[PDB]
Amino acid sequence: VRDNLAHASAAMLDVAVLPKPVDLALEAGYWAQLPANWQWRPRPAPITS
Amino acid sequence: GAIESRKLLASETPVGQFIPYSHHVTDTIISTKNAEYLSVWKIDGRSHQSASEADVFQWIRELNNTLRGISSANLSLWTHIVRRRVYEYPDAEFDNVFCRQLDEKYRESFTGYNLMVNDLYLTVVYRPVSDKVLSFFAKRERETPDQKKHRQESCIKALEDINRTLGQSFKRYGAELLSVYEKGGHAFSAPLEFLARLVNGEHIPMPICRDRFSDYMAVNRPMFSKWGEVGELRSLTGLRRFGMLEIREYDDATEPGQLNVLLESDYEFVLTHSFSVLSRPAAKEYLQRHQKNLIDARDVATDQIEEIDEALNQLISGHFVMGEHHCTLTVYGETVQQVRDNLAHASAAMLDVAVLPKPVDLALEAGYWAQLPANWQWRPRPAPITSLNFLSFSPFHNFMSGKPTGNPWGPAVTILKTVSGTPLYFNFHASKEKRLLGNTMLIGQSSSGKTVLLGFLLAQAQKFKPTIVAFDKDRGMEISIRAMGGRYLPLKTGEPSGFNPFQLHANLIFLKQFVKKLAAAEEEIDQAITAMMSDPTVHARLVKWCELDLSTHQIYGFDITEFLDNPEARTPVMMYLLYRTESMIDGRRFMYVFDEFWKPLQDEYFEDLAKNKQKTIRKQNGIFVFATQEPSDALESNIAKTLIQQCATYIFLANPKADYEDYTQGFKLTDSEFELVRGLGEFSRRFLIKQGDQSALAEMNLGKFRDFDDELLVLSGTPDNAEIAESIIAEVGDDPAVWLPIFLDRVKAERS
Amino acid sequence: QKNLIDARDVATDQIEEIDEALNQLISGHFVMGEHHCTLTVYGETVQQVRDNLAHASAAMLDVAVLPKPVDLALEAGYWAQLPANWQWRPRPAPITS
Amino acid sequence: DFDDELLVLSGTPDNAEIAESIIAEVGDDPAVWLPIFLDRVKAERS
Amino acid sequence: MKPPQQQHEAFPLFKGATRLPTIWGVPMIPLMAMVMGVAVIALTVSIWWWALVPPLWFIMAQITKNDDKAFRIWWLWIDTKFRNRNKGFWGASSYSPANYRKRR
Amino acid sequence: MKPPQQQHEAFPLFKGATRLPTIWGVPMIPLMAMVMGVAVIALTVSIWWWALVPPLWFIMAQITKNDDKAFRIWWLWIDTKFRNRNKGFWGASSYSPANYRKRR
């Protein structure tokens, strides 16, 4: 899974986005997967539609 | 003195300090004293002489885009365009008089032509961490041997990923990864040979032993001069004087190929480019320093502000990363004056393009050790450059030059001169169209040079002593076939040849003979002819109106010009001849050679047999050589699709009536390639060779060079000449192929 | 063994081979000693001597043995030939019997 | 792989008529009859 | 003759290779050496120890503005060609391919 | 390889995701916590209670300018991973799929 994450970060860095692995918020990010979990958003950012 | 020698050598400093290498940790990856794992890529560069200007820029863009993913601060690239004299190609050994004399004349024809070929090597290293300061602090601490194993495993995985990505990116290029090759019951290291060549100046095979790579790598004593710009290597083979050079100034433009002028030249050298990629933090810091110093303008320049403003946007959002670059060029020469004048020539060539070089002095050994891919600290003059600019400096452009030795069947069959000037080692086997494909298609338009080229290739390929079976047209190569050991077997009208339609398993073979014999049919004769074959009104008519010995010779032919009207002659003729020669295919080396596709089209089942039999013979020393005098109508054939698909080496002869459509859809070649090809006016000798994806406008010539007097007439094909020489052969009647002098008298009328 | 262990890059193959040899030493009862090999060709002229050296090196490299040419300490190496001249040995190396 | 099936999937008048000759010779409703035809593959797959 | 061509379709370098790291007109590392020398003089005398700094520093600045990072070249020379012994005996700096004969 | 393509037909983001809410260089909620801590110190002593505020506040500002809204990450960690008990027993934070056995 760690090497898979390295591959995925390489793939994201290929396009202009720059990702960073989530640490200290693993459960927060995991519960953020559920569609109804508003409060567990780890890193909300303002973007255009 | 004996004690004096001991105390002197005890004072002497070994060279192992400057060679940071150790065990192969992986078959393709070398270690380092500082855990900087290394892998060498041997690249067969892309052909650039095609001169497709926009496509060069497109290639650079694609290389940058594919490199982006690999670009990370823990990486570096070292490019080495080593250009060497070649000794591996051996003089051929011959038996027949005509071929041997042609070989002698052609070898004499290269007195004064450079035989040096340049091959490109890219070495990529993976330093674990590129911290500016923290690396020094971390270096002085002990580590857990299991955690060092963890670093090993992670670094190897990362480097293997890098190599896979680069190999996928370099599909159009050679993209060959050097790895361990074993020979003689003991392992050897191919990558070690390259590093030795860099450090020793000569290709010395390096066995891999239990000791470390550094201690026994060097076998030649280097002697760098004091207060000098050149150095001398002392070796058993000879003493090599090498001079170095450095680039100190750059230009903005970086139009790709700014360094290509050095490739075609007369001085043997090694060119180094190191691109120690730099992390985006430091990258934007370096950019901001220039930005600020420009903002200190005092009206220095208005344009430069909007020339640099886009830099931030492109660095954040583009696919390029800054880097650290130095270029060092090492000219090898046998005398101090010669290397110095070579350096003057090289500096002139560099000053031709906008770069300004300056000879390296007081850092000769530093620049020399900088050549080794793993020597970080010995960089003499690192400079910050854009990644696009790095690909501009090192665009992997190379004049195509086939492998001189090591090719399947041994050495390159011929050496052909090139318009650019780099000799081309022609050979049938090509990388891509497992066992290499040897197919060749010599398309051309009514140029006798097709016959001359084919005869010259046959005469030179006689070196392997290969079995050759020919189907010529218009009596073109009767004299050439007779010149070497061979039987022409002319299929003239009015006399059936030595073979009768019968043959002497065999019933299975003659079955299809019955079927093809069926003309003017085909249902009642499915087996009523077969039973008589166990042991047709028009069939006995053809039998009454028909109006051999193999393996005693090595070359064969067939005067097959007659059967351009009725395939029911031509189709059984090819069926019988192919079945006859099928036995000798597995015996030794074979090269089928043809002169037409429409007669092969007349078979209507030769495709059915060939679709598998070409693979089958191709597995065991099988080669086809195809020709076409009307390429325009060639591809129309249903079999022509397989003909174009299976071809390995594509050779084009000047066609004034060239087609854009055909040469694009089939005969796959670029638009610039087509323009170059059509640029050949009629009767120009030069002929493009698209051996593999790379291509080069190689040419062959035979004129007096300060020769070829008899061979000029023999190679060509003329009905008058062929019939008259047949008259001589009838008069002499001598199996001693050396009979040539007697015909040389009858040359009086033609050569008057 | 300890010296090979203390390194920046760990080579698991070489360390395992040396450990196997260590195990073999007690069990496969072969003695170890200091070893050195020198080849002293003869040629009438130095150019012929250098050619002979090149041919010997090529023949050796056909096998997986790499000769290291001697540029200096040829005096020590030559005087090493005489039996009982231990001191002048160029570079003794412990070699299994 | 696919050695026998490569010929069977394709369509050729010569191949089809010859295989009809085999089927006439064997005359077996046991569709497993394939091996007998596999011998006559000798001429085509030579 | 050359794949090079006169085209404006260029990837500008921006000439940031002239604006290499500097603090007061000099790279810090050679200036660190200058400070070390000034302290060495301060060991002998304090009156002219600080006084000697501006001359040497100005020399450093004016040299660097001419040919940048030449001090790296100076250090490489001192480290490699200077430190090597037996330069006279061989007629040039030499590095024995073979290791120490004793190595004990 | 990718539907992505290098085109200028772009929908710019404007990079307003860097200019997230702030008042004096910090988000108000963490600064509210800083004010609460300053009041907590003011419970102990008033001399250095206001004095302690600028150091912590400057730390907040300089951290936020580096990586914005990291304080939300800190709060999520404290709330979820820290508050969970029996972390050592399971070797990691665990959440029983089944409800309380008693639940009475």
Side-chain angles (χ1 to χ4, degrees), chain B residues 37-52 54-103:
Chain B
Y37 312 78
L38 188 146
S39 53
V40 172
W41 273 88
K42 160 68 140 54
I43 285 155
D44 291 331
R46 183 194 287 271
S47 54
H48 73 84
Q49 188 64 42
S50 314
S52 58
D55 199 358
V56 177
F57 284 81
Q58 194 259 333
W59 294 330
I60 295 293
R61 301 271 175 75
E62 267 185 333
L63 292 177
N64 173 37
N65 207 351
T66 64
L67 193 150
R68 182 265 305 171
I70 298 314
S71 79
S72 60
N74 297 318
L75 187 74
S76 171
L77 304 157
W78 307 63
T79 310
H80 293 73
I81 305 169
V82 290
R83 183 177 160 97
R84 34 170 192 91
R85 188 147 305 277
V86 62
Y87 308 109
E88 277 184 340
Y89 179 58
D91 50 324
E93 293 82 3
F94 275 121
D95 51 310
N96 190 242
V97 179
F98 163 83
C99 74
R100 182 182 48 263
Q101 280 188 355
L102 170 52
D103 166 81

Coordinates of all heavy atoms in Angstrom, one line a residue, chain B residues 37-103, unseen atoms left out:
Chain B
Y37 N 23.0 4.6 -5.7 CA 22.8 3.5 -6.6 C 22.7 4.0 -8.1 O 22.1 5.0 -8.3 CB 21.6 2.6 -6.2 CG 21.6 2.3 -4.8 CD1 21.2 3.3 -3.9 CD2 22.0 1.1 -4.3 CE1 21.2 3.0 -2.5 CE2 22.0 0.8 -3.0 CZ 21.6 1.8 -2.1 OH 21.5 1.5 -0.7
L38 N 23.3 3.2 -9.0 CA 23.5 3.7 -10.3 C 23.0 2.6 -11.3 O 23.0 1.4 -11.1 CB 25.0 3.9 -10.5 CG 25.5 4.6 -11.8 CD1 26.7 5.4 -11.5 CD2 25.9 3.5 -12.8
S39 N 22.6 3.1 -12.5 CA 22.2 2.2 -13.6 C 22.5 3.0 -14.9 O 22.3 4.2 -15.0 CB 20.7 1.9 -13.6 OG 19.9 3.1 -13.5
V40 N 23.1 2.2 -15.9 CA 23.5 2.8 -17.1 C 22.6 2.3 -18.2 O 22.3 1.2 -18.3 CB 25.0 2.4 -17.5 CG1 25.4 2.8 -18.9 CG2 25.9 2.9 -16.4
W41 N 22.1 3.3 -19.0 CA 21.3 3.0 -20.2 C 22.1 3.2 -21.5 O 22.7 4.3 -21.7 CB 20.1 3.9 -20.2 CG 18.9 3.3 -19.4 CD1 18.7 3.5 -18.1 CD2 17.9 2.5 -19.9 NE1 17.6 2.8 -17.8 CE2 17.1 2.2 -18.8 CE3 17.6 1.9 -21.2 CZ2 15.9 1.4 -19.0 CZ3 16.5 1.1 -21.3 CH2 15.7 0.8 -20.2
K42 N 22.2 2.2 -22.3 CA 22.8 2.3 -23.6 C 21.7 2.6 -24.6 O 20.8 1.8 -24.9 CB 23.6 1.0 -24.0 CG 23.8 0.9 -25.5 CD 24.8 1.9 -26.0 CE 25.8 1.3 -27.0 NZ 25.1 0.7 -28.1
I43 N 21.8 3.8 -25.2 CA 20.7 4.4 -26.0 C 21.2 4.4 -27.5 O 22.3 5.0 -27.7 CB 20.3 5.7 -25.5 CG1 19.4 5.6 -24.3 CG2 19.5 6.5 -26.6 CD1 19.4 6.8 -23.4
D44 N 20.4 3.9 -28.4 CA 20.6 4.1 -29.8 C 19.8 5.3 -30.2 O 18.6 5.2 -30.4 CB 20.2 2.8 -30.6 CG 21.1 1.6 -30.3 OD1 22.3 1.9 -30.0 OD2 20.6 0.5 -30.4
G45 N 20.5 6.4 -30.4 CA 19.8 7.7 -30.5 C 18.9 7.7 -31.7 O 19.0 7.0 -32.7
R46 N 17.9 8.7 -31.7 CA 17.0 8.9 -32.8 C 17.8 9.6 -33.9 O 18.7 10.4 -33.7 CB 15.9 9.8 -32.4 CG 14.9 10.1 -33.4 CD 13.9 11.2 -33.1 NE 13.0 10.9 -32.1 CZ 11.8 10.3 -32.3 NH1 11.4 10.1 -33.6 NH2 10.9 10.1 -31.3
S47 N 17.4 9.3 -35.1 CA 18.0 10.0 -36.3 C 17.5 11.4 -36.4 O 16.2 11.6 -36.4 CB 17.7 9.2 -37.6 OG 16.3 9.0 -37.7
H48 N 18.4 12.3 -36.6 CA 18.0 13.7 -36.7 C 18.2 14.3 -38.1 O 17.7 15.4 -38.3 CB 18.8 14.6 -35.7 CG 20.2 14.7 -36.0 ND1 20.7 15.7 -36.9 CD2 21.3 14.1 -35.7 CE1 22.0 15.6 -37.1 NE2 22.4 14.6 -36.3
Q49 N 19.0 13.6 -38.9 CA 19.4 14.2 -40.2 C 18.2 14.3 -41.1 O 18.2 15.0 -42.1 CB 20.5 13.4 -40.8 CG 21.1 14.0 -42.1 CD 21.7 15.3 -41.8 OE1 22.5 15.5 -40.8 NE2 21.5 16.3 -42.7
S50 N 17.1 13.7 -40.7 CA 15.8 13.8 -41.5 C 15.4 15.3 -41.6 O 14.7 15.7 -42.6 CB 14.7 13.0 -40.9 OG 15.2 11.7 -40.5
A51 N 15.9 16.1 -40.7 CA 15.7 17.6 -40.8 C 14.3 18.0 -40.8 O 13.9 19.0 -41.4 CB 16.4 18.1 -42.0
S52 N 13.5 17.3 -40.0 CA 12.1 17.8 -39.7 C 12.1 18.7 -38.6 O 12.0 18.3 -37.4 CB 11.2 16.5 -39.4 OG 11.7 15.8 -38.3
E53 N 12.1 20.0 -38.9 CA 12.4 21.0 -37.9 C 11.4 21.1 -36.7 O 11.8 21.1 -35.6 CB 12.5 22.4 -38.5
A54 N 10.1 21.1 -37.1 CA 9.1 21.1 -36.0 C 9.1 19.8 -35.2 O 8.8 19.8 -34.0 CB 7.7 21.3 -36.6
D55 N 9.4 18.7 -35.8 CA 9.4 17.4 -35.1 C 10.5 17.3 -34.1 O 10.4 16.6 -33.1 CB 9.5 16.3 -36.1 CG 9.1 14.9 -35.5 OD1 8.7 14.9 -34.3 OD2 9.0 13.9 -36.2
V56 N 11.6 18.1 -34.3 CA 12.7 18.1 -33.3 C 12.2 18.7 -32.0 O 12.3 18.2 -30.9 CB 13.9 18.8 -33.8 CG1 15.0 18.9 -32.7 CG2 14.5 18.1 -35.0
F57 N 11.5 19.9 -32.1 CA 10.9 20.5 -31.0 C 9.8 19.7 -30.3 O 9.7 19.6 -29.1 CB 10.3 21.9 -31.4 CG 11.3 22.9 -31.6 CD1 12.0 23.0 -32.8 CD2 11.6 23.9 -30.7 CE1 12.9 24.0 -33.1 CE2 12.5 24.9 -30.9 CZ 13.2 24.9 -32.1
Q58 N 9.0 19.0 -31.1 CA 8.0 18.1 -30.6 C 8.7 17.0 -29.8 O 8.2 16.6 -28.7 CB 7.2 17.5 -31.7 CG 5.9 16.8 -31.3 CD 6.0 15.3 -31.3 OE1 6.8 14.7 -32.0 NE2 5.2 14.7 -30.4
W59 N 9.8 16.4 -30.3 CA 10.5 15.4 -29.6 C 11.0 15.9 -28.2 O 10.9 15.2 -27.2 CB 11.7 14.9 -30.4 CG 11.3 14.1 -31.6 CD1 10.2 13.4 -31.9 CD2 12.1 14.1 -32.8 NE1 10.2 12.9 -33.1 CE2 11.4 13.3 -33.8 CE3 13.3 14.6 -33.2 CZ2 11.8 13.0 -35.1 CZ3 13.8 14.4 -34.5 CH2 13.0 13.6 -35.4
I60 N 11.5 17.1 -28.2 CA 12.0 17.7 -27.0 C 10.9 17.9 -26.0 O 11.0 17.6 -24.8 CB 12.7 19.1 -27.2 CG1 14.0 18.9 -28.1 CG2 13.1 19.8 -25.9 CD1 15.1 18.1 -27.3
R61 N 9.7 18.4 -26.5 CA 8.6 18.6 -25.6 C 8.1 17.2 -25.0 O 7.8 17.1 -23.8 CB 7.4 19.2 -26.3 CG 7.7 20.6 -26.9 CD 7.4 21.7 -26.0 NE 7.8 23.0 -26.5 CZ 7.2 23.7 -27.4 NH1 6.1 23.1 -28.0 NH2 7.6 24.8 -27.8
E62 N 8.1 16.2 -25.8 CA 7.7 14.9 -25.3 C 8.7 14.3 -24.3 O 8.3 13.8 -23.3 CB 7.5 13.9 -26.5 CG 6.1 13.9 -27.0 CD 5.9 12.8 -28.1 OE1 6.9 12.5 -28.8 OE2 4.8 12.3 -28.2
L63 N 10.0 14.5 -24.6 CA 11.0 14.0 -23.6 C 10.8 14.8 -22.3 O 10.8 14.1 -21.2 CB 12.4 14.2 -24.1 CG 12.7 13.3 -25.3 CD1 14.2 13.6 -25.8 CD2 12.6 11.9 -24.8
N64 N 10.6 16.1 -22.3 CA 10.4 16.8 -21.0 C 9.1 16.3 -20.3 O 9.1 16.1 -19.1 CB 10.3 18.3 -21.3 CG 9.9 19.1 -20.1 OD1 10.3 18.8 -19.0 ND2 9.0 20.1 -20.3
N65 N 8.0 16.1 -21.1 CA 6.8 15.7 -20.5 C 6.9 14.3 -19.8 O 6.4 14.1 -18.7 CB 5.7 15.7 -21.5 CG 4.3 15.9 -20.9 OD1 4.2 15.9 -19.7 ND2 3.3 16.1 -21.8
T66 N 7.6 13.4 -20.5 CA 7.8 12.1 -19.9 C 8.7 12.1 -18.7 O 8.6 11.3 -17.8 CB 8.2 11.1 -21.0 OG1 9.5 11.5 -21.5 CG2 7.2 11.0 -22.1
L67 N 9.7 13.0 -18.8 CA 10.7 13.1 -17.7 C 10.1 13.7 -16.5 O 10.6 13.5 -15.4 CB 11.9 13.8 -18.2 CG 13.2 13.8 -17.4 CD1 14.4 14.0 -18.3 CD2 13.2 14.9 -16.3
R68 N 9.1 14.5 -16.6 CA 8.5 15.3 -15.5 C 8.2 14.3 -14.3 O 8.5 14.6 -13.2 CB 7.2 16.0 -15.9 CG 6.6 16.8 -14.8 CD 5.5 16.0 -14.1 NE 4.4 15.5 -15.0 CZ 3.5 14.7 -14.7 NH1 3.4 14.3 -13.4 NH2 2.6 14.2 -15.6
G69 N 7.5 13.2 -14.6 CA 7.1 12.3 -13.5 C 8.3 11.8 -12.8 O 8.3 11.7 -11.5
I70 N 9.4 11.5 -13.5 CA 10.6 11.0 -12.8 C 11.4 12.1 -12.1 O 12.1 11.9 -11.2 CB 11.5 10.3 -13.9 CG1 10.7 9.1 -14.5 CG2 12.8 9.8 -13.3 CD1 10.1 8.3 -13.4
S71 N 11.2 13.4 -12.6 CA 11.9 14.5 -12.0 C 11.6 14.7 -10.6 O 10.5 15.1 -10.2 CB 11.6 15.8 -12.8 OG 10.4 16.3 -12.4
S72 N 12.6 14.4 -9.7 CA 12.5 14.7 -8.3 C 13.9 14.8 -7.7 O 14.8 14.3 -8.3 CB 11.7 13.5 -7.6 OG 12.4 12.3 -7.7
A73 N 14.0 15.6 -6.6 CA 15.2 16.1 -6.2 C 16.2 15.0 -5.9 O 17.4 15.2 -5.8 CB 15.1 17.0 -4.9
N74 N 15.8 13.7 -5.7 CA 16.6 12.6 -5.3 C 17.3 12.0 -6.6 O 17.7 10.8 -6.5 CB 15.9 11.6 -4.6 CG 15.4 12.1 -3.2 OD1 16.1 12.8 -2.5 ND2 14.1 11.7 -2.9
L75 N 17.3 12.7 -7.7 CA 17.6 12.1 -9.0 C 18.8 12.9 -9.6 O 19.1 14.0 -9.2 CB 16.4 12.2 -9.9 CG 16.5 11.5 -11.3 CD1 16.4 10.0 -11.1 CD2 15.4 12.0 -12.2
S76 N 19.4 12.3 -10.6 CA 20.4 12.9 -11.5 C 20.5 12.2 -12.8 O 20.1 11.0 -12.9 CB 21.8 13.0 -10.8 OG 22.7 13.5 -11.7
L77 N 21.1 12.9 -13.8 CA 21.3 12.3 -15.1 C 22.8 12.7 -15.5 O 23.2 13.8 -15.4 CB 20.3 12.8 -16.1 CG 18.9 12.5 -15.7 CD1 18.0 13.5 -16.5 CD2 18.5 11.1 -16.1
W78 N 23.5 11.7 -16.0 CA 24.8 11.9 -16.6 C 24.8 11.3 -18.0 O 24.5 10.1 -18.2 CB 25.9 11.3 -15.8 CG 25.9 11.7 -14.4 CD1 25.0 11.4 -13.5 CD2 26.9 12.5 -13.7 NE1 25.3 12.0 -12.3 CE2 26.5 12.6 -12.4 CE3 28.2 13.0 -14.1 CZ2 27.3 13.3 -11.4 CZ3 28.9 13.7 -13.2 CH2 28.5 13.8 -11.8
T79 N 25.0 12.2 -19.0 CA 24.9 11.8 -20.4 C 26.4 11.8 -21.0 O 27.1 12.8 -20.8 CB 24.0 12.7 -21.2 OG1 22.8 12.8 -20.6 CG2 23.8 12.1 -22.6
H80 N 26.7 10.7 -21.7 CA 28.1 10.6 -22.2 C 28.0 10.2 -23.7 O 27.7 9.0 -24.0 CB 28.9 9.6 -21.4 CG 29.2 10.0 -20.0 ND1 28.2 10.0 -19.0 CD2 30.3 10.4 -19.4 CE1 28.8 10.5 -17.9 NE2 30.0 10.7 -18.1
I81 N 28.3 11.1 -24.6 CA 28.4 10.8 -26.0 C 29.8 10.4 -26.3 O 30.6 11.2 -26.8 CB 27.9 12.0 -26.9 CG1 26.5 12.4 -26.4 CG2 27.9 11.6 -28.3 CD1 26.1 13.8 -27.0
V82 N 30.1 9.1 -26.1 CA 31.4 8.6 -26.4 C 31.6 8.3 -27.9 O 30.8 7.6 -28.4 CB 31.8 7.4 -25.5 CG1 31.9 7.8 -24.1 CG2 30.7 6.4 -25.6
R83 N 32.6 8.9 -28.5 CA 32.8 8.8 -29.9 C 34.2 8.1 -30.1 O 35.2 8.6 -29.6 CB 32.8 10.1 -30.6 CG 33.0 10.0 -32.1 CD 32.8 11.4 -32.7 NE 33.4 11.5 -34.1 CZ 32.8 11.4 -35.2 NH1 31.5 11.2 -35.2 NH2 33.4 11.4 -36.4
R84 N 34.2 7.0 -30.7 CA 35.4 6.1 -30.7 C 35.8 5.7 -32.1 O 34.9 5.5 -32.9 CB 35.2 4.9 -29.8 CG 33.7 4.4 -29.9 CD 33.6 3.0 -29.2 NE 32.3 2.4 -29.5 CZ 32.1 1.6 -30.5 NH1 33.1 1.3 -31.3 NH2 30.9 1.1 -30.6
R85 N 37.1 5.4 -32.2 CA 37.6 4.7 -33.4 C 37.1 3.2 -33.2 O 37.0 2.7 -32.1 CB 39.1 4.7 -33.5 CG 39.6 4.1 -34.7 CD 40.9 4.8 -35.2 NE 40.6 6.3 -35.3 CZ 40.1 6.8 -36.4 NH1 39.8 6.0 -37.5 NH2 39.9 8.1 -36.5
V86 N 36.8 2.6 -34.3 CA 36.3 1.2 -34.3 C 37.4 0.2 -34.7 O 38.0 0.5 -35.8 CB 35.0 1.0 -35.1 CG1 35.3 1.4 -36.5 CG2 34.5 -0.3 -34.9
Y87 N 37.7 -0.8 -33.9 CA 38.6 -1.9 -34.3 C 37.8 -3.2 -34.4 O 38.4 -4.2 -34.9 CB 39.7 -2.0 -33.4 CG 40.5 -0.7 -33.2 CD1 40.5 -0.1 -32.0 CD2 41.3 -0.2 -34.2 CE1 41.2 1.1 -31.8 CE2 42.1 1.0 -34.0 CZ 42.0 1.6 -32.8 OH 42.7 2.8 -32.6
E88 N 36.6 -3.3 -33.9 CA 35.9 -4.5 -33.7 C 35.5 -5.1 -35.1 O 35.5 -6.4 -35.2 CB 34.6 -4.3 -32.9 CG 34.9 -4.4 -31.4 CD 33.6 -4.3 -30.6 OE1 32.6 -3.8 -31.1 OE2 33.7 -4.7 -29.4
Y89 N 35.3 -4.3 -36.1 CA 34.9 -4.8 -37.4 C 36.1 -5.5 -38.0 O 37.1 -4.8 -38.3 CB 34.4 -3.7 -38.3 CG 34.0 -4.2 -39.7 CD1 33.0 -5.2 -39.9 CD2 34.5 -3.6 -40.8 CE1 32.7 -5.5 -41.1 CE2 34.2 -3.9 -42.0 CZ 33.3 -4.9 -42.2 OH 32.9 -5.3 -43.5
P90 N 36.1 -6.8 -38.3 CA 37.3 -7.5 -38.9 C 37.3 -7.5 -40.4 O 36.2 -7.6 -41.0 CB 37.2 -8.9 -38.3 CG 35.7 -9.1 -38.2 CD 35.0 -7.7 -38.0
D91 N 38.5 -7.5 -41.0 CA 38.6 -7.7 -42.4 C 38.0 -9.0 -42.8 O 38.3 -10.1 -42.2 CB 40.0 -7.6 -42.8 CG 41.0 -8.4 -42.0 OD1 40.7 -8.6 -40.8 OD2 41.9 -9.0 -42.6
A92 N 37.2 -9.1 -43.9 CA 36.6 -10.3 -44.3 C 37.6 -11.3 -44.9 O 38.7 -10.9 -45.4 CB 35.5 -10.0 -45.3
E93 N 37.2 -12.5 -44.9 CA 38.1 -13.6 -45.4 C 37.3 -14.3 -46.6 O 36.1 -14.7 -46.4 CB 38.4 -14.6 -44.4 CG 39.4 -14.0 -43.3 CD 38.6 -13.3 -42.2 OE1 37.4 -13.2 -42.3 OE2 39.3 -12.7 -41.3
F94 N 37.9 -14.4 -47.7 CA 37.2 -14.7 -49.0 C 38.0 -15.8 -49.7 O 39.2 -16.1 -49.5 CB 37.1 -13.5 -49.9 CG 35.9 -12.7 -49.6 CD1 36.1 -11.3 -49.2 CD2 34.6 -13.2 -49.6 CE1 35.0 -10.6 -48.9 CE2 33.5 -12.4 -49.3 CZ 33.7 -11.1 -49.0
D95 N 37.2 -16.5 -50.6 CA 37.7 -17.6 -51.4 C 37.6 -17.3 -52.9 O 38.6 -17.5 -53.6 CB 36.9 -18.9 -51.1 CG 35.4 -18.7 -51.1 OD1 34.9 -17.8 -50.5 OD2 34.8 -19.5 -51.8
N96 N 36.4 -16.8 -53.3 CA 36.2 -16.6 -54.7 C 37.0 -15.3 -55.2 O 37.1 -14.4 -54.4 CB 34.7 -16.4 -55.0 CG 34.4 -16.3 -56.5 OD1 33.9 -15.3 -57.0 ND2 34.7 -17.4 -57.2
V97 N 37.5 -15.4 -56.4 CA 38.4 -14.3 -56.9 C 37.7 -13.0 -57.1 O 38.1 -11.9 -56.6 CB 39.1 -14.7 -58.2 CG1 40.0 -13.6 -58.7 CG2 39.9 -16.0 -58.0
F98 N 36.5 -13.0 -57.7 CA 35.8 -11.8 -58.0 C 35.4 -11.1 -56.7 O 35.6 -9.9 -56.6 CB 34.6 -12.1 -58.9 CG 33.5 -11.0 -58.9 CD1 33.7 -10.0 -59.8 CD2 32.4 -11.1 -58.1 CE1 32.7 -9.0 -59.8 CE2 31.5 -10.1 -58.1 CZ 31.6 -9.0 -59.0
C99 N 34.8 -11.8 -55.8 CA 34.3 -11.2 -54.6 C 35.5 -10.7 -53.7 O 35.4 -9.6 -53.1 CB 33.5 -12.2 -53.8 SG 34.5 -13.5 -53.0
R100 N 36.6 -11.5 -53.7 CA 37.7 -11.0 -52.9 C 38.3 -9.8 -53.5 O 38.7 -8.9 -52.7 CB 38.8 -12.1 -52.9 CG 40.0 -11.8 -52.1 CD 41.1 -12.9 -52.1 NE 41.4 -13.4 -53.4 CZ 40.9 -14.4 -54.0 NH1 40.0 -15.2 -53.3 NH2 41.2 -14.8 -55.2
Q101 N 38.4 -9.7 -54.8 CA 39.0 -8.4 -55.4 C 38.0 -7.3 -55.2 O 38.5 -6.1 -55.0 CB 39.2 -8.6 -56.9 CG 40.5 -9.4 -57.2 CD 40.8 -9.4 -58.7 OE1 40.0 -8.9 -59.5 NE2 42.0 -9.9 -59.0
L102 N 36.7 -7.5 -55.2 CA 35.8 -6.4 -54.9 C 36.0 -5.9 -53.5 O 35.9 -4.7 -53.2 CB 34.4 -6.8 -55.2 CG 33.2 -6.0 -54.7 CD1 33.3 -4.6 -55.2 CD2 31.9 -6.6 -55.2
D103 N 36.2 -6.9 -52.5 CA 36.4 -6.5 -51.2 C 37.7 -5.7 -51.0 O 37.8 -4.7 -50.3 CB 36.5 -7.8 -50.3 CG 37.1 -7.6 -49.0 OD1 36.4 -7.1 -48.1 OD2 38.3 -7.8 -48.8

